[PDB]
Amino acid sequence: SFDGFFLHHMTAELRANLEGGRIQKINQPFEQEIVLNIRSNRQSHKLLLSAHSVFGRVQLTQSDFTNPKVPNTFTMILRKYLQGAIIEEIRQLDNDRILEFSVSNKDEIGDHIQATLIVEIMGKHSNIILVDKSEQKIIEAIKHVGFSQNSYRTILPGSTYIRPPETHSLNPYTVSDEKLFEILSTQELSPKNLQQVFQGLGRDTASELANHLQIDRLKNFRAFFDQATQPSLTDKSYAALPFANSPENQPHFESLSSLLDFYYQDK
């Protein structure tokens, strides 16, 4: 699934191709989707950012797009900040389904412009938010959300950016030996409870994880998260590793992005 774990692998892939890259073009070919043409490593890349409530995702793509004639105000402000900008850093927020693109640019007079494009993948509450580095203020957002008594946050130009409400879960990538030892040593290790204790684990992932924690648990835990990216289809979905019961007649995907190009082909 497109969980936090999968995002860890995808982030890695995106960085290898795009970090240090230059944003050539910005387009919004569909309602909740933005595509950035990027030049990096003497290759030209297409980066898809989707806050679609059902198919929300990030990936490079080989797909071609028919861009609208008349740009929108959101695109316009994005272009104004990102066109020609350099992608200095791509960073996942902990093991959550949130990805940040730190870009640098110059304004009309040569002064240093720094922004952070934030992609929050949370189903129907997904968003793409441009934020100013210095004073953490929202520049623009693909979906604006008012102050409401209902909310811990406001999503509007000028608003102060607060990250989605922190959870009690633990990043499984940064869990210390001692803390990790006591968990695997005293807690229930069912797929469901693993989902609870750790950030960014989908049900498919946590299930696969579980099959690996009956012995040598500490080292086994480490080993699962240290596996190399191996893009595959699963029973109902896709993953960055070949989970149990994966289809058997499967092509070798040269990347997670080609995997998703394939999976989302028919919408």
Q: What is the dihedral of CA 19, 25, 29, 33, to 10 degrees?
A: 30
**Using CA atoms, how far apart are residues 12 and 97, in angstroms rounded to an integer?**
14
Residue 244 CB-density burial (10 A; 0-12 exposed, 13-18 middle, 19+ buried): exposed
Q: Residue 236 forms beta bridges with which residues?
A: none
- What are the residue boundaries of the structural domains of the chain, listed by start? 1-166, 167-228, 229-267
Question: Considering Cα of 47, then 98, then 101, then 131, what sign does the dihedral take?
Answer: positive
Q: Which tokens in the block code for residue 116?
A: 């952070």
Say what angle helices 177-186 and 217-225 make with each other, to 10 degrees: 120
What is the CATH architecture assignment of 1-166? Roll (2.30)
Instruction: Please name the method used to determine this structure.
Output: X-ray
Q: Residue 92 forms beta bridges with which residues?
A: 99
Residue that the structure tokens 């992005």 belong to: 257
**Using CA atoms, how far apart are residues 142 and 38, in angstroms rounded to an integer?**
20
Q: Which tokens in the block code for residue 213?
A: 């924690």
Edge-first strand listing for the sheet containing 127-132: 57-60, 43-50, 33-40, 22-30, 86-92, 98-106, 112-120, 127-132, 137-141
What is the CATH architecture assignment of 229-267? 3-Layer(aba) Sandwich (3.40)
**Using CA atoms, how far apart are residues 124 and 143, in angstroms rounded to an integer?**
11
HSE-CB of 18 using CA atoms within 13 angstroms: 29
Burial 115-138 (b: 16+ CB within 10 A, else e): bbbbbbbeeeebbbbbbbeeeeeb
